[PDB]
């Protein structure tokens, strides 16, 4: 009888939603866990934080599952605040709520889906020697993650017997002012083939309208960029050069109505595994205010066990930076008429891609040797 | 670990030196056997000696 | 034009100074005062610097310390709050290094220098005093870490390394197994770090093991001073003092002059757009406070009543004063004064753990080796 809350932003099908929250079977667990579809918009922080508090006091929520619609990034780090504030569990399965933070609080209780920057740039290397592109560029700004992200590759190719050359590394700050001048200056030392790039979506869009300036974005430049920097699949900025290449979750035959589902499922195993053993359960005095004395009882051990579960022969086990160490990745293309085209699927280390050569869109012979 | 005892080119050059510079010594063999190298361990950012 | 400014206070008599001080600085653009009391939770901290931004539309906000001791969490919710909307907040009581962190807080600045900046005033005691082994005893927290790169980016600077770091997890009743070989080392000087309470259990067991007799020099911080520690402590131990730390009054008074300067060079510029008022209504990143945070840092303050204010490339304070304390006979008496980049001793002497009176080597060469 633990109570769990499903929110929803914006529009969205909360009638499919509903019909297939009763899709799963769990009769072998004692849990008749109660479901609350609430909607709300997407007014500011103090309406979700008004929002979680009338529903924990309304009655005996015991979980929350958090999607959105939205491309926001901070609502991920107040999502976290309230985790680290009460104790009550909560998960990020859409919209900016999966947006990957800096770092977890300690005493945080906060999961979310989707890679972390260590599983994005090691995915990337991977379609770097499908296709033989041994010579790169390395170029990103200040963002809760860059150090980390050069970090991983050097390590990964300073170890290898395949030939890696790496020229140069950029740390150029766009919050300069009249520093415009002398990133374009900087921009013009780049002369690899391949080129990574690590931003947000308005300083890569500023970032390659500068390059564009310089010009290195028509024919023999190719550039990857992480799942964060496209975000939504819909809208484009039209300054994006064509034929980038991104990854990104995979949302097309991952619908909502599944990962409700999988978030349910998580949570009620969490609680059952962890009910039987120890013969307890959590259920606080369900109030927002005055929880300055509500932390006397520790949830630590149902924290400590969120990140082991199984159900329907699937691996859903989190990681200790509170990433899903397991997701399911898809590689896309811009092409012409501005859109994102599904080229490549990903999964447990092992690349799939759909072509065999990459088309290029002379000076470029066919040999034959014997 | 148990006591041995060790001789050689390397075991008196030492007791020559101790009788010059005046100190006093406690010898032991190596754990794992090996002379030294720069490696890297569990998936970490640094790097440390063996 | 009419811009208003505000603050967060917990003081009756604060808000009436900060009254006055408003008031006299409308005599040097008219500029207002809006402060609230604090509450005993962080969500009514968060909800109420929503509100209140909504009702004043400021351009920054004022925080000290409430009159808990730690001052650690309540800063928090003002910061993300503040943050995510991106307006400058000037912090003036807060000591905690986790501030200093960019990517968690985006906007926010020191009137105060961090715990973890007084190692330069031991880097100048090593100098002065010859000394060249010390072993460098913290805790495993944040606040531990960051004193201690400090100290090895300082010293890497000499190309002379600590001969010993050892670490003891927080909140621990038993350290005497770490203090052991800690005694059978070549270095006499211990340089210490953690919380009062945590320096107490050290303070025991250092006595107990005769650590504290003559020939050991002890060199501890401000909170190592403080507290309880005071009733278990060996005599002879030299601490430190910051100058105004605990004045709050004078703090408020300079940092108004600082904003204020501010604000008469931020409406003298083209595309200025005042900061929406609308707390449930925006979601939108306001374009002003980017480029108000770069003038606002380099706005170096020509002469206030606390000695000059300047900020370095963190939002941390510049050219702070110490005062070198000695405990003697139960008493603690000032001894030096650190005008940042000098050490001057007064005409008082200093008195040696152990009783005597003579800088003592902090060395003793060992004459078997391994
Ligand atoms: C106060 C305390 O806990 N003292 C113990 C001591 O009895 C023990 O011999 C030692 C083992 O290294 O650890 C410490
Ligand atoms: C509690 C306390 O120390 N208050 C003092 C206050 O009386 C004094 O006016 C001010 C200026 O130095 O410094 C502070
Ligand atoms: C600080 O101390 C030094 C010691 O050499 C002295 O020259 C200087 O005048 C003092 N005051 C300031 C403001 O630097």
Redesign the pocket.
Same mark, same amino acid.
């Given at each position: 009888s633990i109570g769990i809350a499903v929110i929803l932003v914006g529009t969205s099908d909360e009638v499919a939603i509903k019909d297939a929250h009763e899709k799963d079977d769990f009769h072998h667990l004692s849990v008749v866990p109660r479901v609350e579809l609430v909607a709300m918009n997407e007014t500011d922080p103090k309406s979700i934080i008004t929002r979680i508090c009338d529903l924990m006091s309304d009655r005996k929520i015991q979980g929350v599952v958090f999607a959105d619609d939205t491309d926001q990034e901070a609502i991920a780090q107040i999502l976290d605040f309230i985790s680290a504030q009460t104790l009550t569990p909560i998960l990020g399965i859409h919209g900016g709520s999966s947006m990957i933070m800096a770092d977890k609080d300690e005493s945080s209780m906060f999961f979310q889906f989707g890679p972390s920057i260590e599983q994005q740039a090691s995915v990337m290397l991977n379609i770097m020697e499908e296709y033989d592109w041994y010579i790169f560029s390395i170029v990103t700004t200040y963002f809760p993650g860059y150090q980390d992200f050069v970090n991983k590759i050097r390590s990964t190719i300073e170890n290898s017997f395949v030939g890696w050359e790496l020229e140069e590394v950029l740390l150029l700050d766009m919050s300069l002012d009249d520093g415009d001048s002398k990133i374009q200056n900087q921009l013009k030392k780049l002369q690899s083939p391949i080129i990574l790039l690590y931003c947000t979506k308005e300083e890569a869009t500023y970032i390659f309208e500068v390059a564009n300036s310089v010009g290195l974005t028509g024919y023999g430049y190719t550039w990857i960029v992480p799942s964060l920097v496209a975000g939504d699949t819909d809208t484009v900025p039209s300054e994006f050069p064509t034929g980038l290449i991104s990854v990104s979750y995979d949302e097309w035959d991952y619908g909502l109505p599944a990962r409700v589902r999988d978030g349910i499922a998580i949570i009620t195993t969490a609680a059952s595994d962890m009910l039987s053993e120890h013969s307890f359960i959590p259920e606080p005095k369900s109030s927002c205010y005055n929880t300055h004395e509500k932390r006397i009882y520790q949830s630590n051990m149902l924290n400590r066990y969120l990140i082991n579960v199984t159900f329907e022969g699937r691996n859903l086990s989190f990681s200790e930076d509170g990433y899903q160490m397991h997701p399911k990745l898809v590689i896309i293309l811009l092409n012409k008429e501005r859109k994102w085209e599904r080229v490549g699927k990903w999964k447990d280390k092992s690349l799939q891609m759909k072509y065999y050569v990459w088309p290029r869109m002379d000076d470029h012979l066919s040999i034959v040797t014997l | 670990t148990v006591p041995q005892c060790c001789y050689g080119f390397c075991i008196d050059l030492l007791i020559k030196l101790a009788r010059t510079m005046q100190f006093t010594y406690e010898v032991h063999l190596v754990a794992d056997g090996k002379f030294g190298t720069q490696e890297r361990v569990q998936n970490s950012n640094k790097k440390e000696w063996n | 034009k009419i811009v208003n400014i505000g603050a967060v206070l917990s003081t009756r008599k604060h808000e009436q100074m900060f009254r006055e001080a408003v008031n006299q600085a409308n005599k040097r653009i008219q500029l207002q005062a809006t402060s609230v009391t604090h509450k005993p939770n962080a969500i009514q901290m968060a909800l109420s610097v929503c509100e209140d931004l909504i009702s004043s539309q400021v351009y920054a906000i004022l925080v000290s310390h409430p009159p808990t001791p730690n001052d650690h969490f309540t800063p928090t919710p003002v910061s993300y709050t503040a943050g995510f909307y991106r307006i400058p907040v000037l912090g003036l009581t807060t000591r905690m290094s986790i501030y200093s962190d960019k990517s968690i807080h985006l906007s926010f600045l020191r009137t105060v220098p961090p715990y973890s900046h007084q190692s330069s005033v031991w880097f100048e005691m090593m100098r002065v005093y010859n000394w060249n082994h010390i072993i460098l005893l913290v805790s495993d927290d944040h606040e531990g870490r960051a004193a201690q790169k400090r100290l090895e980016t300082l010293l890497e600077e000499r190309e002379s390394k600590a001969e010993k770091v050892l670490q003891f997890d927080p909140g621990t009743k038993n350290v005497t197994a770490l203090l052991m070989e800690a005694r059978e080392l070549e270095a006499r000087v211990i340089i210490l770090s953690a919380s009062e309470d945590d320096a107490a259990t050290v303070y025991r067991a250092a006595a107990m093991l005769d650590m504290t007799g003559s020939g050991y020099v002890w060199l501890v911080g401000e909170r190592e001073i403080s507290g309880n520690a005071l009733r278990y402590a060996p005599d002879g131990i030299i601490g430190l003092q910051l100058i &105004?730390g605990? &004045?709050?009054?004078?703090h408020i008074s300079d940092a108004v002059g600082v904003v204020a300067q501010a604000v008469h060079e931020l409406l003298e510029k083209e595309n200025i757009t005042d900061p929406p008022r609308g707390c449930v209504g925006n979601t939108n990143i306001w374009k002003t406070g980017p480029l108000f945070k770069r003038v606002l840092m380099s706005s170096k303050y020509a002469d206030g009543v606390t000695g000059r204010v300047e900020f370095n490339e963190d939002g941390d304070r510049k050219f702070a004063q110490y005062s070198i304390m000695n405990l003697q006979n139960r008493k603690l008496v000032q001894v030096g004064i650190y005008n940042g980049t000098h050490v001057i001793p007064n005409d008082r002497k200093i008195i040696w753990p152990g009783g005597e009176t003579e800088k003592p080597r902090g060395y003793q060469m060992s004459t078997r080796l391994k």
């Open positions: - | - | &105004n605990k &004045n709050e009054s004078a």
